[PDB]
């Protein structure tokens with residue numbers, strides 16, 4: 001409340017640490033379905049079904065241009081990539097498996113880096 005503040009968690013390194021995590025996901029061998037936006041002209045039903053498309057290159061752009069107010073907004077966009085993947089792809093597909101693998105990879109890096 002007014003003039004009563006919890007101790008301040010140090011967030012000064014967050015931008016650099018998120019960039020590092022993003023780099024590791026970009027270089028994962030299973031990253032290939034997620035490196036660029038899905039082509040909305042060539043993929044049947046993707047535009048109508050997937051309300052908020054997201055991919056690693058778009059995250060990298062937003063991160064580099066100060067469009068994430070904080071580390072949670074960044075994690076939300078990473079998770080959106082894999083939530084979109086699950087919605088549109090069968091679990092028993094190369095891309096479906098890639099999504100599950102990358103989500104697991106991300107959440108471990110997330111925990112170890114910030115929690």
Ligand SMILES: CC(=O)NCCc1ccccc1
Nearest residue numbers: 033034038043085088089095
């Ligand atoms: C990342 C992602 O979901 N890409 C599209 C999956 C896809 C499925 C079927 C045909 C073409 C494309």
